Design a protein around this ligand. Structure first.
Ligand SMILES: Nc1ncnc2c1ncn2[C@@H]1O[C@H](COP(=O)(O)OP(=O)(O)OP(=O)(O)O)[C@@H](O)[C@H]1O
Ligand SMILES: Nc1ncnc2c1ncn2[C@@H]1O[C@H](COP(=O)(O)OP(=O)(O)OP(=O)(O)O)[C@@H](O)[C@H]1O
Ligand SMILES: Nc1ncnc2c1ncn2[C@@H]1O[C@H](COP(=O)(O)OP(=O)(O)OP(=O)(O)O)[C@@H](O)[C@H]1O
Ligand SMILES: [Mg+2]
Ligand SMILES: [Mg+2]
Ligand SMILES: [Mg+2]
Lengths: 545, 545, 545
């Protein structure tokens, strides 16, 4: 608390200071050859090489330094929460691209660097190799994302490939045995759960299994304002349309406040003739992106309803009670028994979501809009599996669960969006390609030269694509010969790397070293934004008002 | 809190400091001739030569230093908690091997050091002398691991040798007298106990002795979910199959949450006709690795059950009420009376476990998987003995209790895995062997030389094998003659050492100086991992997030 | 808290400092001519020459210094708690022998020093002059241990001699008069007392005098586990065997936890027919060494029972209700009336303990094992005496009570083990003897010379025996003539010292200056151990974990 207002020379110095310290720490963990980082936590020591774990728990003493550290760390942390295996890359490029922005000042050069790197992104996005569950590269991806786990990669790839048709939903548990053990189901994880613990069997939040139901999906949040219309709708359904009905009635919605739940408790007590063995016949269900309720509506054959007053005006043409088999729960509900007649409705709705993705743009295919829509497909078509992960201690069991979770996140986003050849190669191919593409094109080579090549940006950006390949294999067998390394035509056609597990030299495709497309793309995208932000900041404020 | 991120040169410096300080402390306590360490605790002074106690209670002021200290200590602390007498050797070799790793940098050399030490481990695993309880070397191992306790070694060794057939399970109590006192039982310690104090005789966690029971082993944990099925199962067992039944009914499980206990309380009161002299006829038993329950099932002739619903579907074929003698208890349960009919089932199951160990690999025979399967054997075949340890004060009693427990843990893991000749000899013979074996073999000498001998790692490793033998006998009779010492072929054939108790000079085999195999192996195994980690760490984080 | 790990030079430096500081403070107070020490406590001044009270209350600011202080002080403090008058001699030799240990480093010398001093202890052990209560040297010991109290020494040595047969158990109360007043009894002090204050007459911790009782001695501690067996055994004892029973029933044991006490309260409530004048008929009694309970059993004709269940299986052969006279109390119980039939049993059990001591080894006679068995004998055979000590003020009364207690403790351990001539003479006679013995012995002179004489240890140890005699009399009339003092053959045959009370010169035997054997031996014993510990320590750890 000497000075709270840092401007100009002082500001950029601290940004550079922090970036170059965060760079040094996280990049040292890269690949299977990476060096280790010890981390304190009270009275223990988690000693690690997983870049995410490093980046997240790096802290700084000065508030000014930690201010900037949050800006460098929060992007790369936010890659792995959605993607799976791709944080150290993001930081590496953040550093690299910042360096570039400073080499070429003046804010016409800054707009040029963006446009160039934005076209490098497009070339990666087009380089995305699409892959089926049948393919043996999925193993090769898992093998890479697991830091070479022969026993794990095999399982998850075998698990996806044995379900050649339906995309498996995986969850994890801390197991008891040394060996791993799997629990396959024909079950679909659904996002609805109990509003109040009173509505379960036994009246304290238990797991109520049903063999018949009649669902209704409401759009609005329900509070003290809707208590009149529920009593209007519920007594309308039970009095008039009792003939075509299978109990219990499920009132699925966004939210049920405590005023609404206490009203529905009285409505179950109002008609005790329908209470079979304790089970309440009326359940309100909640969900914490409006189209996810339309999935829940389609899975249970329930009508989509905007207002709570719509429950009165209903008919046998809109009302249809299912005779399947559901399991209501406190965290989430699960559907098991689905008739072939129902799965025809669900597959047709799934194709309909997929036909939207067929017609998206290439850059839109990697958007959050796209990734949210693909989350809906897995909820609809997707069997449930639970793996109880083992190990020799409690600590290895918990350690191994994370590495399962990284492989599941990677395999899912691999076949979802694409695959690229690893070893820092696809970045070099993309940059060296994008330069040559605009240059080779006689239509625009007049100006493309004047902006990027003539200025020197092109040659700088090409040097920076090397960064990843250098950091992996500098100080190895591959780099000892010929001083540094020649990235000539001959290399670009058949790009040699080293498998750091074995030692042998070959192509990434040949050795079996593959990155997830979504990672090495979203690393670059994030690298540019965060480099720009860092490079274009000239004022730090620490004042707590 | 000047800097929370320590990279590179600084990082290794602190690691070197904290290792070499911890080395200088703990290694000073080695052997019977070892020097002492005074330890503060509030308002008292523990003065000790026990390297475990030193290593465990070494602390550092700087958080960064303690960060590394924990990584050096926790492996050595981790040996004694499963082994018995072998902590100082672990730290010694952590130091030595760290020193090696740094002398040969570059991450091809590192992989070579590992593989060379890894092959030395295999030579120590093959050097393991397999020993029976009859053997007078068992005394010599106890004597060694007791720092020359003529009285103690003699007792425990005699105690193992007098039961030539069944492996003793020993426990220790704070005895009152000057003399020790022994309480032999024909009992088998079993890992089950009361879920609630109410289910004992007198209804407050007392010791219930039985002379007849009918057991059942459930695999799942039991909570509010399982209350219904218990009432279905228990009434089904008492109403239908009451004819072939010896009370009480035992319900052995993983865990019983308080809901399940209160249901089984009511079930005892429900059928008061069967309550003989207060004793509840239904007892739920808890155990804090599913195969240990299978052992419990096999000892009691109880059927193994996956679910709680399985209690309904049962018959005279699966139900069997034993007329033995069991003593239920709060901490544990004890089976004393076993009919010759029953022990044939148990021994055949015990053989089956040994037949899995027969066929395990050599390095797998020193795995946690292996040692867990040997724990099962002692639980099945094994008599219970309790020793009330005596001494001149309260403090010498409590002191002598640990020296008992160190000797029991050693003798057990000696005959379990193996024995080696001590005095730091076995380490030298192993290394000087492993170098000569690969070098003498004309098949692979061409490359073995190029990696290990020609580089200099082979000569380096040989010198570090001598560390233990030097630390013990440098500044003694043995090292006075010939300046230092000549580790020539002559010494390798018959290695001379000094017994630090008596003072005479001879072979470890002659003088009676033997390390356990599981100690001096797991010291090297843990020495390598921890030397790698230290040598390959290049970042320290102290940030409380 | 600058550093929490002091090694090597610095560790020994602080030890030397602390030892030499404790040496200067405590040895100042030695003898009658010793110089005073003023001690602070809050808001008052204790000014003293009592070496125990000095050593105990010496404190150090630095944690590391106090760490070492505890190790030098706790051994000297632990002499008086069992001996009486012999703490300053212990610290002196702790210093002197530390000095020796460091002059001769290298751990073959260390073992030679130990064995030499061990043999000096054996010469002190044989020089012990055995003494009967009739002997006038008992006055001369008391005089020495009272710092020349003409009146006090006279009382105590008369009080032992007057009871020429049974050994007196003495206890002290703060008296009211100027004079002292004695209260003789034919009673035996017993270590048992109330578990809870309910069981006394009037139900609130009063003194209960009984004139008949039926005792039972249980070995185990009693807790919530045992409450049922108490209800079985007590009702068994009252229902079946009421004919041969005198009330009340005493359940003597190791400990009674609050659960068991509440159960026995109900048991007194259960049979109100047997409650005579408020007195509860069932009392539990606790004692804070199983053979001390066997004494209690033998004194009260009660059976020795290993388990609580053993109360059921009993008979008129095992049950014997005494009609003596017993006074139950809150601190301790007292037995007054013993029929000559019963004392015939108690004397026979006393002889059996004496027959064990008769046949102990010489060095075994000075062990803790030996002394604890002699403690038992006094409990059995011995009359109770209570002296109320008076004086001019309250502070003189309390001051005089401690000097009383010191003289009783010395006289007891004087006639128990032996007596030696004081003035620091016995030590010099012992050391000069032990050197001459082995050296003059033809059989071992060869190697005796090479170990002690030829190295220089013998002459160093000869000088250090003088420390006591030099401290007492340097700067007196005795040391003025002939520079220092010639410890020659002439002196050894008749050793001259000075009575520091009178000022006359003569032999210790002649002037009537006598140490107790156990003290001067226990100073040298512990003085070696503590000198060795200090000398061999090379690591200090201040870390609270
Ligand atoms: N056997 C191998 N040989 C060569 N390169 C490899 C090998 N395994 C992985 N890689 C490369 O290492 C890089 C990945 O390193 P790492 O997994 O440490 O970074 P990250 O994925 O960003 O971090 P995190 O996994 O913590 O999110 C990729 O470029 C990949 O091609
Ligand atoms: N009488 C002896 N003479 C020579 N060496 C001995 C003797 N007794 C034990 N040793 C050696 O000393 C070493 C054991 O050291 P020490 O017992 O101090 O530490 P540790 O067993 O590694 O761990 P812990 O502190 O748990 O006992 C072994 O190498 C053993 O061979
Ligand atoms: N009148 C005396 N003349 C000569 N020496 C004496 C006299 N009285 C006592 N001493 C000597 O003083 C020494 C006893 O020391 P002192 O009683 O001061 O302390 P301590 O017995 O070692 O321990 P404590 O402080 O518990 O009494 C003995 O060596 C004894 O011979
Ligand atoms: Mg990972
Ligand atoms: Mg030990
Ligand atoms: Mg005194």
């Amino acid at each position: 608390s000497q000075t709270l207002l840092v401007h100009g020379k002082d500001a950029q110095g601290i940004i550079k200071q922090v970036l170059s310290e965060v760079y040094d720490a996280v990049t040292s963990t890269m690949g299977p050859n990476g060096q280790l980082v010890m981390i304190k936590n009270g009275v223990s020591t988690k000693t690690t090489k997983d870049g995410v774990t490093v980046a997240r728990s790096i802290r700084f003493a000065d508030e000014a330094h930690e201010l900037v550290n949050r800006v460098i760390t929060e992007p790369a942390t936010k890659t792995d929460e959605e993607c799976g295996d791709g944080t150290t890359t993001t930081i590496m490029l953040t550093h690299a691209l910042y360096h570039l922005f400073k080499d070429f000042p003046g804010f016409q050069h800054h707009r040029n660097i963006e446009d160039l790197v934005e076209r490098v992104i497009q070339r990666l996005e087009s380089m995305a190799i699409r892959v089926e569950v049948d393919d043996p590269r999925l193993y090769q991806v898992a093998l890479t994302s697991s830091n070479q786990d022969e026993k794990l990669a095999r399982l998850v790839s075998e698990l996806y490939a044995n379900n050649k048709g339906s995309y498996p939903d995986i969850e994890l548990k801390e197991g008891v045995n040394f060996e791993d053990q799997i629990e396959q189901t024909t079950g679909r994880t659904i996002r609805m759960f109990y509003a109040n613990p009173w509505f379960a069997k036994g009246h304290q939040g238990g797991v109520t299994e049903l063999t018949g139901f009649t669902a209704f999906v409401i759009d609005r949040r329900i509070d003290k304002e809707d208590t009149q219309k529920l009593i209007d709708g519920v007594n309308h359904l039970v009095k008039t349309h009792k003939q075509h009905l299978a109990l219990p009635i499920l009132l699925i919605a966004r939210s049920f406040e405590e005023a609404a739940n206490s009203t529905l408790m009285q409505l179950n007590a109002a008609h005790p003739t329908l209470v079979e063995d304790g089970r309440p016949w009326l359940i309100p269900l909640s969900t914490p992106g409006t189209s996810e309720l339309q999935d829940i509506a389609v899975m249970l054959n329930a009508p989509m309803l905007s207002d709570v007053a719509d429950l009165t005006k209903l008919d046998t043409h809109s009302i249809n009670g299912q005779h399947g088999q559901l399991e209501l729960g406190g965290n989430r509900s699960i559907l098991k028994s689905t008739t072939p007649k129902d799965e025809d409705r669900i597959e047709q709705h799934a194709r309909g979501i997929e036909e939207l993705l067929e017609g998206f743009s290439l850059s839109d295919k990697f958007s959050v809009r796209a990734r949210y829509n693909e989350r809906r497909i897995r909820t609809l078509r997707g069997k449930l599996i639970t793996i109880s992960v083992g190990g020799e201690t409690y600590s290895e069991v918990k350690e191994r669960v994370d590495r399962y979770e990284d492989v599941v996140k990677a395999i899912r986003s691999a076949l979802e969006n694409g695959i690229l050849p690893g070893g820092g190669v696809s970045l070099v191919k993309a940059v060296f390609g994008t330069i040559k593409e605009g240059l080779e094109d006689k239509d625009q080579s007049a100006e493309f030269a004047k902006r990027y090549i003539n200025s020197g940006i092109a040659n700088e950006l090409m040097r920076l694509s090397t960064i990843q390949h250098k950091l992996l294999f500098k100080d190895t067998a591959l780099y000892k010969e010929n001083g540094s390394f020649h990235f000539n035509d001959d290399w670009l056609n058949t790009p040699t790397v080293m498998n750091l597990a074995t030692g042998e030299i070959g192509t990434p495709e040949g050795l079996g070293i593959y990155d997830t497309a979504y990672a090495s793309i979203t690393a670059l995208k994030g690298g540019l934004q965060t480099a720009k932000i860092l490079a274009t900041t000239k004022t730090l404020i620490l004042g707590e008002k």
